[PDB]
With several copies, the nearest count.
Chain A
Amino acid sequence: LLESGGGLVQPGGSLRLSCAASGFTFSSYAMSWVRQAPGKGLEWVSTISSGGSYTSYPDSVKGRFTISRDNSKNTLYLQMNSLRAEDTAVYYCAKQDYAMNYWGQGTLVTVSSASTKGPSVFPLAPSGTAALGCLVKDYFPEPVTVSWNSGALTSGVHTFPAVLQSSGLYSLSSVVTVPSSSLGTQTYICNVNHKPSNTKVDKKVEP
């Protein structure tokens, strides 16, 4: 099961999710949509009958969202209209039996008025063992990927979950613990990639 179609939308706007079913007879299986807001889910969104004739929804999304399917295309859809900020979540599609057996990895839907912004990357300069890092500040929406020395440095790397600031923009830190001696010589670069904004940033952290 593979979801797609989720990204940033403005409130009061529309988005149509899709879910690619393969490896089983989809047309003979009832389907479901279940979401998880960053902290911490889970919530039932909708269920559809194997044929498509029958659909049930909770009062939270009823009238706004519509679960549909095209068995010939082996695809499950979720038309989300009249979107609210409270609908910001990772959206999963799953097979419906007595319970959701087999879930897709999901798709993140972000409902906000805040415009797409690329991050500002600032260093966290080092002072036995020494700590070094990058501050990935003011970016929207999620996610951002942080690497060290183009994937070469990975031991002792801690990329912290992004914290949504008062501004409505995200901010995170990626730190690395390295021996003191390596500084001055070993060159440390954080490779930041913010796909939702087509922005790639390589930052050199030095004392």
Chain B
Amino acid sequence: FGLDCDESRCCRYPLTVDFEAFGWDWIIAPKRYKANYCSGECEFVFLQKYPHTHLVHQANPRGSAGPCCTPTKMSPINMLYFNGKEQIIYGKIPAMVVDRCGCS
């Protein structure tokens, strides 16, 4: 399992994606859905690792020196949207919702 939080470790923070507010009216439904993401530290463990970790944020903040706080379990969502041919499709779009957050 994983940990779920709101308001320290690799925890799940909820986030509602609004396609209206984003300005993507081409997707009819859902206008809004609870999506979530993963934030927090991933390993301690011992200790000579700290220089390699600290050096990572200096070179590339997008870089990972070890396990990352990434979603483990992801659920799909059913979506109604306009296609670039003037038609409206219903589709099962995979991995839209984050269900669990763990360390890689």
Contacts and interface: CB of A to CB of B under 8 A. Distances in A.
Q: Do chains A and B touch in the complex (CB under 8 A)?
A: yes
Given A28-B31, A30-B28, A56-B88, A49 B20 contact: no
Interface string A93-118: 00011100000000000000000000
A55 interface: yes
Interface residues of B, number: 15
Nearest to A53: B25
Interface in B10-28: 20, 23, 25-26, 28
A51 B23 contact: yes
A47 B28 contact: yes
B60 interface: no
B56 interface: no
Interface string A57-97: 10000000000000000000000000000000000000011
A49 B29 CA distance: 10
Contacts of B20: 28, 50
Interface in B76-98: 78, 80, 82, 86-88, 90
A54 B82 CA distance: 7
A50 to B, nearest CB: 4
A47 to B, nearest CB: 6
B29 A54 contact: no
B26 A98 contact: no
A47 B88 contact: yes
B86 A49 contact: no
Given A96-B29, A97-B29, A98-B28, 20 more contacts: A28-B20, A28-B31, A29-B31, A49-B25, A49-B28, A50-B20, A50-B25, A53-B26, A54-B25, A54-B26, A54-B82, A56-B82, A56-B88, A57-B86, A96-B28, A97-B28, A97-B30, A97-B80, A98-B29, A98-B90
25 contacts: A28-B31, A30-B25, A30-B28, A30-B29, A47-B28, A47-B88, A49-B25, A49-B26, A49-B28, A49-B82, A50-B25, A50-B31, A51-B23, A51-B25, A53-B25, A53-B26, A54-B25, A54-B82, A55-B86, A56-B86, A56-B88, A57-B86, A96-B28, A97-B31, A98-B29
Interface of A: 28-30, 47, 49-57, 96-98
